[PDB]
Amino acid sequence: SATRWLPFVSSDLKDYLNRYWAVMFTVGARPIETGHIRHYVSWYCTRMKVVLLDHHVYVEPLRQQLQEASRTPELPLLFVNKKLVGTLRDVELLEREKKLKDVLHFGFEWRVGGSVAATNGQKSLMGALPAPYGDAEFFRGRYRGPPVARPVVSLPTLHPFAL
Amino acid sequence: VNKQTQKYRTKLRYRFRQPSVVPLRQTLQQRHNTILEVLRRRR
Amino acid sequence: NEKYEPWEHMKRMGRLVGTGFYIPPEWYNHFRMFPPINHNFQTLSPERVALRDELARKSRLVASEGMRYYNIFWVRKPLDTMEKEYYELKRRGVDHGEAIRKVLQGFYSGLAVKKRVAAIQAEEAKLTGRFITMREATVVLGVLAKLHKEQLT
Amino acid sequence: DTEFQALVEFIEGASYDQLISGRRFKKVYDVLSENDDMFIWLCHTAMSVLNPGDMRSRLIYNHLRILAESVASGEMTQRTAFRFFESAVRSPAYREIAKRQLEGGAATRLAGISAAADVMRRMGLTRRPMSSYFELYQRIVERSEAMTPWGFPPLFQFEERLSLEPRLKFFSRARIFWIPPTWNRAGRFLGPHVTLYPGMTPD
Question: Do D27 and D133 contact (CB within 8 A), yes or no?
């Protein structure tokens, strides 16, 4: 409007975090791990800035600064609310623990103990109160739970990157 | 503008366009999960 | 929508109470004494940087392409000697480029003296055959190990 | 006690017709959830993240305390109280106090919600005299307003619009939200009379 359109570029990692809400720094040789984070972030309707490090003018400054924020040299890396989310093992962990909604929308991770993935029916306490004197193992007539099933053989997957 | 600048302007308008993000498939996915939970819990 | 606002609701409650035929609740007078919260009405010195840039750019060419000497040891003492000689010449205030010329001439003479004493010590260590540097010891501990790996296969 | 009376009626009905029906469980779900303790816990967990030494936080604390006492007295309805609460929460003074309490590290919000439970016990803001401590345990051990770093439930109605704009991807950029009637095929029962919400799917 008042200014002509211009592509944003920076030699420092701090200017990318202070500008966008969700920044991702990818490579062109890794299309599967990039597209999985594209599916997760767009599912929660979050605006995202994808920075392809192939054909960039500050590759060597940005590859050094991404090594300091995240100790692993693995790309892509998700950055939400000036914090480090991590690689696909960190994004899928928040999706499994149902934490990816409040990370992408409000910029914080739940520090609540206990897992919300293994729930049945309504979510209540259901024996989450602390037992007196411990010793939950010594009562062998306890409620073991419903019987679960396990596959005898592994079925062939649809795609190697289906998951 | 002339014909060339008008064609390039409408090409840039169709190329860089902001769509209407209406969360419809997530609504239907939440409804599908709720219907599956009702069918699992109650006969 | 501003038609549902705590200030508008307080104004509506106040003009409802001001008739005299409506009895105020406790929160009306308790909000007159505690109103709702509103959103409105609220290193290195740079000359030394340029000097070290010029001196590093002019010393890198005399050390790399000029002298062809890559095993130079303890460069910080001749570089700080270049700095202190530059400040000594800037005390009297002679020139700018000529001070750099004399500083680079002194640095070249110091590099030549260090190269000559390194060559003299290396020549006297190689002539007598009694003294062995640590790099030669590392290289014989490596090559005897490689000869033993040849013996192992 | 009307909740124990409704539980007695539920037990008598489930012993009468010898099955767990839909009418009786809906009745006791309506009886056991008539309490306004949710909004009182909202106001008190907003009061917990404040500063007892700052005068601005004292003003916010007394405002939210008066709001919770007016809700518990029944003199103020729930919708105007929610408007008062979201106007007190969206202010930059309260958000700056919450940011300072986050930047502290030895935060006083745990003693805040503990004193809040003691106040709700003493002033009669609950249904049972010892239910506020179980509600405190429920706020602590579960995902709730007490584990949010700013002290309100994390919905987008309690967060500012200028922070809502760059994060979320809504209908159009650069109130009650509706589907416009250009979508003749949106879902099976979706239409223009079906409202949508920015940060949640209530379906």
Answer: no
For D188, nearest residue in chain B (alpha carbons) = B28
Shortest distance between the Cα of A153 and any Cα of chain D, in A, equals 38
Q: CB–CB of D84/C36 below 8 Å?
A: yes
Resolution at which this structure was determined, Å: 3.1
Distance CA A100, CA A54 (A): 28
CA C88-C91-C95 angle, to 5 degrees, is 90
Q: Which amino acid is at D26?
A: K
Minimal Cβ distance to B21: which of D171, D187, D203: D171
In the block, tokens 């799917």 appear at: D201
Beta bridge partners of D195: D178
Name residue A26's beta-bridge partners: A52
Which D residues in the span 131-170 are in contact with A, Cβ-Cβ below 8 Å? Answer: 138, 141-143, 147-149, 154, 156, 159, 166-170
Rounded CA-CA distance A106/C48 in Å is 46
Is C77 in a helix, a strand, or coil?
A: helix
Instruction: Give which of A75, A87, A83, A80 is closest to A25, Cα–Cα.
Output: A75
Among A59, C75, C106, A21, which Cα is nearest to D168's? Answer: A21
Structure tokens at A101: 């909604």
Q: How was this structure determined?
A: cryo-EM
